[PDB]
Amino acid sequence: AQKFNGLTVLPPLLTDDMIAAYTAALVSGTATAGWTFGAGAALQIPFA
């Protein structure tokens, strides 16, 4: 009915897979390098 009366819903540019990929990259960066004071050149460090 919505479409028959000329009301359309458009898809977002970024899919769910892309957002999940971004979050996975952020978590991996925190676990591996854990950059502090910004997001530049990752510096590896043991988690402990």
């Binding site: 479409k3 359309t8 458009l10 898809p11 899919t15």
Partner: protein, 36 residues
């Protein structure tokens, strides 16, 4: 120009104004006039 039809499945009576040489399907609908 290129034309995107949101509610048409062109994979392999189509409700499109005109066809072309670069009709193909995407996750956003049927696209005509653009090369992939």
């Amino acid at each position: 120009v290129a034309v995107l039809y949101q509610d048409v499945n062109c994979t392999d009576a189509w409700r499109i104004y005109s066809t072309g040489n670069n009709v193909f399907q995407t996750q956003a609908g049927c696209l005509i006039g653009a090369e992939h």
